[model samples]
Target chain A: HMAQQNILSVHILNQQTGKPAADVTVTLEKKADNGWLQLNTAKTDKDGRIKALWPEQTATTGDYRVVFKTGDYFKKQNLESFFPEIPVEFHINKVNEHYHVPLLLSQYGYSTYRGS
Target chain B: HMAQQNILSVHILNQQTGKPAADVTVTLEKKADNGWLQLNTAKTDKDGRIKALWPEQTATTGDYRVVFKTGDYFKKQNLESFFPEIPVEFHINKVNEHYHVPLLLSQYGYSTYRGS
Candidate 1:
């Protein structure tokens, strides 16, 4: 028998303020025909990153999403924002390789990418 | 008496391969109760940027969107993509100020920011 592995890494950055947003909660999910289903959750460290989100078992190829719980983060700082939350939906094709997703965030906007 | 001014700037880039994405078409629109109304369209230069996309007169404060026609762009390069088109919706709170929006794109993913 052979064992498999799947790992997902995410980074969150505040480009406007130029700082790492710590304590940000990031939820990972898979999108099915019905809708999005929660898979896992992690909190950013002081450096603003959840290095990896993986299951105890092996992973499969599918469409996944990351919901950044940003409202609370902004509220803590007493900052007004345009978007209450930011959700990024992406997919994974290969499981053996690693997936790096980075989010560049601001008070009013945000962006993401599939990193190497 | 005084006059008003509105301006929008945009930049496009391919992050995976680390290069500017030129010849991409970007359209700006305002989203209202009815739907989205096209305001302007511009093609990226060699630098992968459109410095400004503004109305002949001043603009009004409202929710707006930028649609990047990435399907055609990828097709031209013979690459396959997941999203046919990318639509990013944001808002403008002040008419006298300038808005800078940038798109960081890849073959299968992309991100945008409210640039300075």
Candidate 2:
């Protein structure tokens, strides 16, 4: 069975180029009373896989947002695309339950979902 | 041929509930030199559909962003969701082509794409 606790991961892909997005900065920020707190930050590997944002660092349940810096990624490809940056916010309620999110991105559009 | 001009529409649905998300607040903004500019705003009808954001006034080629306010929607269902809001950014290279964008949302995740 899938270990459903203390986990959060993100997978991103470039739909237009049909390839994984490597070297793209991904960040996880938690909502706080004062402001958002930076929880974790990392870049994707060759397969578009980033280490768990909160491998052992995040467990408390609250509001959080994931940001993808797509601007620089596309610029490196020498293409003019919209949305220099993309942000996705979600909540964690089951205290330690795991969640996987994925982003399907293109030059003019994007799609995201809670993955299995 | 599809009248691919002077058009932008949105269709949203709740994945968990398997129903259209009606009364959603959708907004579109254009990126500018100084900052992002709000272009249009609309609320989804009973069928979880919204009219074109730029029905008659948008035709310039530039960067644009779409915002979906999901906090209240989830709140009404007495559910706690992760993302209080969702933001998507994309470029518009062809100034006068029609674009149908769709949003697939859930309590913990969401996705959007450039529809046909």
Candidate 3:
């Protein structure tokens, strides 16, 4: 069996129409001593996922934030959203364990949770 | 204009299929001095929403938790899920303000966020 070692993953879904939010831009950043250091940015695929978020399949201990560029996404669809961008901040305590961050989004609301 | 005072609202969507998670059970409770006091429980509609969660449509300042019964929802579809249940806790600071809590869920992962 293959060792399950995907460091980080992200998925986004549009809750309004129950569809995968394809082509949505996502940005990953880490909190540094002075400020936030950009790590990686990618767009959700047709299935709404970024299976391997970082260049290296390993993550270090730190506080990280994932910003979803939702404004332009909704704008492209001719919709209005309460949030221009959605920023989810979480702490990473373990290095080897995988972290899965997902966004469930709508024009007026959204939610994120720590998942297994 | 009508005063926008919906006490609390909850929405759930299945990220795997990008569909509203209908008929999923949701329970709301407040942290009382003694322990948790059950407030209301309802199932998500076809649109995956509980538009008015509280009986009085008024929310006071307190710490509250909303529990989503995800195990049975997936089980009914003959699927496996990493989480049996999902609980989201949040605090309310103002009396007249509304709180929107939405859940984006999959078999292995889920997210909850404060929504507008």
Candidate 4:
């Protein structure tokens, strides 16, 4: 089995407010032939963040997806949003290098990109 | 008085694999006098999403930002990431509608856009 020594981290934030969102759920899964395999599950702190999805020793070069569930979050606050969920898909080529994935979220719109 | 009825939805997904990110922290802020004003804070659900940052009736035209805290998330897993944090800035011209902001996260890179 081959594994990468480096680790990858992902950060998410909202542009409307300058505060951390707590209790948000984030899941990291790998696409399998039949279905998706559960890789890791994480939650944001008071500052709204879920760093590394997988372990550093387990980081490998492959396809992955990061999904954001906005409906439930809004429901908790008695709010209704346009999108029920936000899904982002990307690829990894180098195993030994570090990767940073981040998300910018809002009520009516959102954006993401490759971070430093 | 003028208000446009337009709802913008943003969706975030990881391309490498496919899944929603849960428990990720997201914050919405508007640029104010000398600093940023806190608008709202939200977290992703089981599907990785923070639908609306502001209310439909309150959504106004202005500059906003969504911050993703990837560092803390990775720290919990004992992983070292490249970026300490991720910040995304955008503008909203219309109000009295909906806006969806999403993010795509990974260890090495990410991407975002104006979602439908």
Candidate 5:
């Protein structure tokens, strides 16, 4: 039921194989007064996407973060990994424009971009 | 005095500005049975490079990681950021070769790759 084009979305791809990485847990948090508060936790779908994250759909423009648990994911593939976890922080702006953050991952490397 | 090709090196570039991100703190750690152990910490040079991290310059084949304090760095630029911090972990194999891990950064995005 998540279908807001003006919220935060994530896509994680295994660049080495040129395919979406599924079943990886992605957690969302919003910066708060004293600490960051958990907002949502969703695994990547078949297409490596987690969309429509903001339910409040309320006001935007705040600090937010996404953490990728790459260790367990890599272990499932029998791949030894360097990253136990990957956390990315960014700001939420323009509650009217979609913000897509994508992760391109490998056994020993990873990259993230502000997606379209 | 640093010339061993068999070590971990880091380079940070501001993709948004197309320049090297300087004076950023880069910390190196090695994974052990108990937990992660700190190995070294160095600020980026003029070209945003930190080379010759492993002074031991000895055998390889272990897990290593680098933590980049993006929040502090971004604050210096007066740019609002999403990442409070960025941590990248990887393995070290083939002690005879060099491993370059580079970070591409922006206010709202960042990436790291296994460089040659």
Candidate 6:
């Protein structure tokens, strides 16, 4: 059996259109003393998922943030949104457990939660 | 026929503990040119729901915000959280339609979305 490793992932769902938000840009950052250190940047696939975000390094327990570029996404759809960008900051404690951040979004609002 | 009016509602689910965040304080406000105009403040019930947040008035098409006093909630549980408070802002275009905002929360992270 190929033992898979736990990792960090993200997904996005459009509540306004009730569809997976494909091709949206997502950026990951780590909290640093001076400022946030950029870790990775990618676009969601057709299913609105970025399966693995963490680099090849060992998992570290610390503060992190995910910035979703919603403005451009909405702009392409020709819709007005209240937030130009959405930033979600979180702390990681259990490095062994997989972290899945799912964003349920609309043109006017959005929600995020840690998933299984 | 008893006519029911569309209204705004909120609910919170604790992802870390997998429980309903009952008794958590939630404040509702409408966006104003100067600042947020407080509409009402209430606590989530046993079902983690504030079924109605809009005050008794004509539904206005504009912007609104919901502030969740989440720090106190985690403090009462003896847990540390990244955010002391969580504020979600949204634009309201469909005044005739019911609006539901749900928060999926954890000690270090939270998500919000426009619900059905």
Candidate ranking under lDDT, highest first, comes to 3, 6, 2, 5, 1, 4
DockQ for all candidate structures vs. native: 0.24, 0.49, 0.06, 0.10, 0.44, 0.24
lDDT of 5 by residue, A5-98 (tens): 6377888889778999898899988889987888888888898788755556475687787888777888998887657777777766666667
**A49-108: candidate 2 lDDT, tens digit per residue:** 774677456367677888998888989989766577888877777664677778898876
Shift of residue B77 alpha carbon in model 3, Å: 0.7
What TM-score does structure 2 among the candidates reach?
Answer: 0.73
Q: lDDT tens digits, residues A26-73, model 6?
A: 999887799778899889999988887787778788878787887688
lDDT of 1 by residue, A14-43 (tens): 887899889899899877889767789989
- Per residue, candidate 3 scores C-alpha lDDT tens digits across A2-102 of 22456778888776546688999999999999789888999999998898776563568889998999888999988877789999998888776778888
TM-score of 1: 0.58
Score each candidate by Cα lDDT: 0.75, 0.79, 0.81, 0.60, 0.78, 0.79
Name the lDDT value of residue B77 in candidate 6. Answer: 90
Cα error, residue A116 of model 3, in Å, equals 17
Q: Chain B TM-score, candidate 5? A: 0.89
Candidate 3 local lDDT, B1-116, one digit each (tens) = 11375578899977555679899899999988978988899999999988877665456788989999988998999977767899998898886767789988766656778886
Question: What tens digits encode model 2's per-residue C-alpha lDDT throughout B1-116?
Answer: 33654477788898988999999999999888987778889998988987567746637877787888887888998987767788777767776677677888887667776777
TM-score of chain A of 1: 0.87
- List RMSD in Å for every model shown: 6.0, 3.9, 10.1, 15.5, 4.5, 6.5
- Model 6, TM vs. native: 0.59
Provide the lDDT at B70 for model 6. Answer: 85
Highest TM-score: which candidate? Answer: 2
Complex DockQ, candidate 6: 0.24
Q: Tens digit of lDDT per residue, candidate 4, span A1-116? A: 11342355666686667555566777776766876676777777666766556654456666676666654676787875544555555556676666666667667656566666
i-RMSD per candidate, Å: 3.5, 2.4, 8.4, 9.2, 2.9, 3.8
